[PDB]
Amino acid sequence: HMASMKKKGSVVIVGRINLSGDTAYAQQTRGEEGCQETSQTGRDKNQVEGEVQIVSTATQTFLATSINGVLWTVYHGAGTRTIASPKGPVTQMYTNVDKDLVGWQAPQGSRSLTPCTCGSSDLYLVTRHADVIPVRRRGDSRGSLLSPRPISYLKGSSGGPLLCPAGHAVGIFRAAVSTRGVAKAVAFIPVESLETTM
């Protein structure tokens, strides 16, 4: 009934991948209970830092990456959901189901990656466990893992970045190609497709 119709909660930042030093490591900034409440209210007063955020809904967790002032992630994770912020839910600035892409204004305190113009094919995928995985670029939107591994290790890292040797953003991870559960390749939204969307 119209009186009982519910609304989906906001995407909530629950942590980040720390890339500031010599060692990449995941940090949690909010536990599951506070995540649930923040998803319902859409208010998040937690300080945001860094480039790669770990984000969660009521039912899914995944990554979001700031590039050029936009926090980017995948539609198959976020749908059309708002993101929680200090002053309430923030509506998406970009939505493209055809690219599996959404974006919101980058949160206050985040740092953005610079879009890559190197034209290099030696990439690095950053996962939600702060693994830095070498990937050889194989096309506009595909790359092969130098060391294949079970897809389990990539699950939950959609929205994470592929970076060039210089640390620029080359793309946003969206899907894994596997054979008998072993990830051999990845698909990503290229930064140029983001830059067009911008």
Binding site residues, ligand ZJJ, CB under 6 A: 60, 62, 75-77, 97, 100, 151, 154-158, 173-177, 187
Binding site partner of 130, from ligand ZJJ, Zn ion, none, Cβ cut-off 5-8 A by kind: none
**What residue 175 binds from ligand ZJJ, Zn ion, none (CB within 5 to 8 A, per partner kind)?**
ligand ZJJ
Contact 72, 83 (CB under 8 A): no
Q: Which is nearer to Zn ion, 42 or 171 (CB)?
A: 171
List the catalytic residues. Answer: 76, 100, 156, 158
Query: Is 35 known as a binding-site position?
Result: no
CB of 87 closer than 8 Å to CB of 43: yes
Using CB distances below 5 to 8 A depending on partner kind, what does residue 118 bind out of ligand ZJJ, Zn ion, none? Zn ion
Distance CA 69, CA 46 (A): 19
CA-only gyration radius of the chain, Å:
16
38: which 2 tokens?
Answer: 């923040």
Give the other-Cβ count within 10 Å of 6's Cβ. 5
Q: Cα–Cα–Cα angle for 137, 140, 141, nearest 5°?
A: 80
Closest approach of ligand ZJJ to the CB of residue 154, in Å: 4
| Residues forming the site for Zn ion (CB under 5 A) | 116, 118, 164, 166, 168
